[PDB]
Design an enzyme around this catalytic site. Structure first.
Site, short mmCIF file in Angstrom:
data_model
loop_
_atom_site.label_atom_id
_atom_site.label_comp_id
_atom_site.label_asym_id
_atom_site.label_seq_id
_atom_site.Cartn_x
_atom_site.Cartn_y
_atom_site.Cartn_z
N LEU A 43 -5.97 -4.54 -2.13
CA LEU A 43 -4.63 -4.31 -1.62
C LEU A 43 -4.55 -3.14 -0.66
O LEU A 43 -3.82 -3.20 0.33
CB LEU A 43 -3.66 -4.06 -2.78
CG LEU A 43 -3.39 -5.27 -3.67
CD1 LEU A 43 -2.49 -4.87 -4.83
CD2 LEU A 43 -2.75 -6.37 -2.84
N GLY A 44 -5.30 -2.07 -0.92
CA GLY A 44 -5.22 -0.90 -0.07
C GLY A 44 -6.27 0.12 -0.46
O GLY A 44 -6.90 0.03 -1.51
N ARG A 45 -6.45 1.08 0.45
CA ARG A 45 -7.30 2.24 0.22
C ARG A 45 -6.53 3.48 0.64
O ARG A 45 -6.01 3.55 1.76
CB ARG A 45 -8.61 2.16 1.01
CG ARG A 45 -9.44 3.43 0.91
CD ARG A 45 -10.63 3.42 1.85
NE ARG A 45 -11.69 2.53 1.39
CZ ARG A 45 -12.75 2.19 2.13
NH1 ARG A 45 -12.87 2.67 3.36
NH2 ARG A 45 -13.67 1.37 1.64
N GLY A 46 -6.45 4.46 -0.26
CA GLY A 46 -5.85 5.74 0.04
C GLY A 46 -6.88 6.85 0.11
O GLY A 46 -8.09 6.63 0.05
N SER A 49 -8.05 6.71 -3.83
CA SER A 49 -8.30 5.51 -4.62
C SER A 49 -8.39 4.29 -3.71
O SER A 49 -7.98 4.32 -2.54
CB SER A 49 -7.20 5.30 -5.67
OG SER A 49 -5.97 4.98 -5.05
N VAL A 51 -7.18 0.17 -4.29
CA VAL A 51 -6.24 -0.55 -5.14
C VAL A 51 -6.50 -2.05 -5.00
O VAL A 51 -6.56 -2.58 -3.88
CB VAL A 51 -4.78 -0.21 -4.78
CG1 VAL A 51 -3.82 -1.01 -5.63
CG2 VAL A 51 -4.55 1.28 -4.98
N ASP A 154 5.22 13.44 -4.55
CA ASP A 154 4.80 12.56 -3.47
C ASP A 154 5.78 11.39 -3.35
O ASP A 154 5.39 10.23 -3.19
CB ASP A 154 3.36 12.06 -3.67
CG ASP A 154 2.74 11.51 -2.40
OD1 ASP A 154 3.20 11.85 -1.28
OD2 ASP A 154 1.78 10.73 -2.52
C1 LIG Z 1 -1.78 4.09 -5.30
O1 LIG Z 1 -1.40 4.35 -6.63
C2 LIG Z 1 -0.81 3.26 -7.30
C3 LIG Z 1 -0.59 2.02 -6.70
C4 LIG Z 1 -0.02 0.98 -7.43
C5 LIG Z 1 0.31 -0.41 -6.85
C6 LIG Z 1 0.12 -0.85 -5.61
C7 LIG Z 1 -0.54 -0.03 -4.51
N1 LIG Z 1 -1.04 0.57 -3.69
C8 LIG Z 1 0.57 -2.26 -5.23
N2 LIG Z 1 0.35 -2.79 -4.02
N3 LIG Z 1 0.89 -4.05 -4.01
C9 LIG Z 1 1.43 -4.31 -5.18
N4 LIG Z 1 2.09 -5.55 -5.54
C10 LIG Z 1 1.26 -3.21 -5.99
C11 LIG Z 1 1.76 -3.12 -7.43
N5 LIG Z 1 2.13 -3.07 -8.51
C12 LIG Z 1 0.35 1.19 -8.75
C13 LIG Z 1 0.14 2.43 -9.36
C14 LIG Z 1 -0.44 3.46 -8.62
O2 LIG Z 1 -0.68 4.72 -9.19
#
Ligand SMILES: COc1cc(/C=C(\C#N)c2[nH]nc(N)c2C#N)ccc1O
Length: 328
Positions: A43-46, A49, A51, A154
């Protein structure tokens, strides 16, 4: 030296909790079964982390898996302890499990899945009623975590997951959150630039829950005025200049004078003199359906230089802006 500051609410919640509640360095992680979760799509990169969407094969339900990048075990245990302390609270993302990822050699946090509406579609289509509704839902989460001794630090649109189909909201990414301890000095390098409170931008370290209310104000301003982000600084210095062109420089000086703060001398060439503006100046034909006297007064009471003067989360929920929102 700088004048000390205390939160005006929830000041002593962690002092009267047992030490185990806030002494996260002593927390013993209870590890789940890593084979319970199969990753489906990234889903993503921060910064901290990656995800993933995953399936929990013990119930065939969707989950989110957040594989932490290598950071200090303090920051990892901090986020875990905060997530366990807040689990079950209104609109707080639910930590379901914690597993050891064998590839990253770091913890992977497993969360409830929120079927999130993308933030572009959300931002361009939320109505006046939608904005009041979801602000109130965010306020429930902020009052909860503040009442539990924790500041998020945040708050920004990317950390507010909305499933608009079920009108369900979750505040996510507690990785910058901290326990509030009266008199403690905190790192000012928190929050995304556009949502940093004045206290961070002037290097005042003894801040508190009220930081989250500035960030929330920045989100509200961007939504009702249809300008995202609202304070759009090029760097952390220009960020304070952008704020001062709206709130004025005289009240900025009053603020730093109250806490015996000194501005970075590099502001001498860039800050200027600026009157405080009236919020009506930001109203135009393309956002006026989102603006009301109640909206402007509520915004005005969130966006204060002086962190001690902003509405608390509970005070905000009392504001007339939410009178039209249907309560359950
Ligand atoms: C980056 O930290 C977090 C991220 C998330 C969730 C997402 C991201 N990024 C996410 N992206 N797309 C989704 N449907 C969801 C959900 N649920 C949940 C708890 C976290 O601590």
């Amino acid at each position: 030296g700088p004048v000390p500051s205390r939160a005006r609410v929830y000041t002593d919640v962690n002092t009267h909790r047992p030490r185990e509640y806030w002494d996260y360095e002593s927390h013993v992680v209870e590890w789940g079964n890593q084979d319970d979760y199969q990753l489906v799509r990234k889903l993503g990169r921060g910064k901290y982390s990656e995800v993933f969407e995953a399936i929990n094969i013990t119930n065939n339900e969707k989950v989110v898996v957040k594989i932490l990048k290598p950071v200090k075990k303090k920051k990892i245990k901090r986020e875990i302890k905060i997530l366990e302390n807040l689990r079950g609270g209104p609109n707080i993302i639910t930590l379901a499990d914690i597993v050891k990822d064998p590839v990253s050699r770091t913890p992977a946090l497993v969360f409830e899945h929120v079927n999130n509406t993308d933030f572009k579609q959300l931002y361009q289509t939320l109505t006046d009623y939608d904005i009041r509704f979801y602000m109130y839902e965010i306020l429930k989460a902020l009052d909860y975590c503040h009442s539990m001794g924790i500041m998020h630090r945040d708050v920004k649109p990317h950390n507010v997951m909305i499933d608009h189909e079920h009108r369900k909201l979750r505040l996510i990414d507690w990785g910058l959150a901290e326990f509030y301890h009266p008199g403690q000095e905190y790192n000012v390098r928190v929050a995304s630039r556009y949502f940093k409170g004045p206290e961070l931008l002037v290097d005042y370290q003894m801040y508190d829950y009220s930081l989250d209310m500035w960030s929330l104000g920045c989100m509200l301003a961007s939504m009702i005025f249809r300008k995202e982000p609202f304070f759009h600084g090029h760097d952390n210095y220009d960020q304070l200049v952008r704020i001062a062109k709206v709130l004025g420089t005289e009240d900025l000086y009053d603020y730093i004078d109250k806490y015996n703060i000194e501005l970075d001398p590099r502001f001498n060439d860039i800050l200027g003199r600026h009157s405080r503006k009236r919020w009506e100046r930001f109203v135009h034909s393309e956002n006026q359906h989102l603006v009301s006297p109640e909206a402007l007064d509520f915004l005005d009471k969130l966006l204060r230089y002086d962190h001690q003067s902003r509405l608390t989360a509970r005070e905000a929920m009392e504001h007339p802006y939410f009178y039209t929102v249907v309560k359950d």
